[PDB]
């Protein structure tokens with residue numbers, strides 16, 4: 144009996160509703176103000192998920208908040224890619240049961256090319272045959288995939304933590320196979336998939352940052368925590384002070 148997977152599966156967040164009035168015409172301001180609200184709500188869930196992760200309260204308290212606040216985009220995109228694959232066979236974007244994106248909403252949001260990228264990512268889940276155990280490990284692993292170039296308050300704890308999640312992923316892959324190249328292939332595949340979440344998250348950091356700057360001119364609302372994170376933390380990523388941790392060089 145695997146204690147690590149039990150935990151990952153126990154703490155997985157439920158459904159989060161976007162609060163969207165689907166009875167509105169699909170306007171830009173309204174799709175975007177709703178996505179923002181989805182962001183702010185999902186944040187609360189990510190925090191409590193992250194805090195109930197194995198080894199996590201180990202990290203220094205400020206590092207705990209830092210790594211949540213750099214990594215959120217990556218996490219939410221990956222999950223949403225999954226929700227999309229499990230429900231709507233990847234065909235649309237399952238932001239929340241009350242906020243699914245069709246083509247038309249992908250154009251109206253004005254972030255059409257990002258949505259296409261998110262859709263693709265979503266499809267990889269099918270193409271690779273990602274099991275729910277792989278999904279869960281990879282997603283938790285994503286929490287420790289982006290950090291300040293000049294390290295964290297307790298970087299050693301962090302590096303140990305991350306190493307452990309990597310080895311746990313290797314475990315979920317390997318406790319079921321036989322032939323030799325099989326487990327190499329697969330691990331290569333997942334490290335590549337995990338890597339590819341980063342340029343997408345980066346496109347979306349740019350996007351939302353831009354939006355926030357021009358939100359008064361455009362009637363898009365940003366909730367308190369989303370405002371703050373996007374103006375304090377995202378800029379550290381955009382300017383290159385915080386950076387992802389790739390497995391492979393691009």
Ligand SMILES: Cc1ccc(OCCn2c(SCCOc3ccccc3)nc3ccccc32)cc1
Pocket residue numbers: 147196197198199200201299300301303304307308311
């Ligand atoms: C809530 C809780 C309880 C016990 C914990 O023990 C730490 C275990 N741990 C760790 S160790 C974190 C490294 O930092 C430390 C902290 C204290 C002493 C030595 C190293 N990495 C893990 C990866 C997967 C699963 C568990 C992992 C962590 C959180």
Ligand SMILES: C[C@]12CC[C@H]3[C@@H](CCC4=CC(=O)CC[C@@]43C)[C@@H]1CC[C@@H]2O
Pocket residue numbers: 178179181182185216219220223238347350351354
């Ligand atoms: C950041 C953002 C609001 C929050 C969105 C984000 C797109 C990706 C995303 C996926 C989710 O499943 C929840 C909300 C988030 C995190 C949106 C892109 C522009 C908008 O400002």
